[PDB]
Structure 1
Amino acid sequence: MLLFCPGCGNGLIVEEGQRCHRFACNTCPYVHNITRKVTNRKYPKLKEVDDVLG
């Protein structure tokens, strides 16, 4: 998903610190360590079994 820093509002990227993977902003020292699993499903559209025409 798209996450933003509460401090300045810029987009957060995922990097690796010294202990664990964390969300971080490129314009402020704000970080956020990941505790549990985080997922972002999209559920793409499944191509239907097209009918035989003619």
Structure 2
Amino acid sequence: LLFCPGCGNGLIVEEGQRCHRFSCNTCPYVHNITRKVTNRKYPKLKE
């Protein structure tokens, strides 16, 4: 969940040319190859 500076309506990623155009007034930050990272480490019980 990354929010919009300007309306604040949550993250939407359009897969055209790597932007973040929200359903409202366009504020598409065309993030370059900066690699997105979201590793939500899970749980690993054993034995």
| TMscore range, shorter length | 0.3 to 0.5
TM-score if structure 2 supplies the norm length? 0.42
- Residues in 2 aligned to 1:23 and 1:35: alpha-carbon distance in whole angstroms: 19
> TM-score, normalization: structure 1?
0.40
Structure 1: tracts of 5 or more residues without a match: 49-54
Q: Give the length in aligned residue pairs.
A: 47
Identity, in percent, stands at 98
Pick closer, same or farther for the CA change 1:25–1:33 going to 2, 3 Å: farther
Say if 1:36 and 1:14 are closer, same or farther in 2 by CA, change over 3 A. Answer: same
Instruction: Please give the root-mean-square deviation of Cα atoms over the aligned residues, in Å.
Output: 4.1
CA contact (8 A) 1:4 1:10 kept: yes
Going by fraction, where is strand more abundant, 1 or 2? 1
The 1:19/1:27 distance shift into structure 2, 3 A limit, reads closer
Q: Secondary structure at the match of 1:41?
A: coil
Long gaps (5+) in structure 2: none
Q: Higher Cα Rg: structure 1 or 2?
A: 1
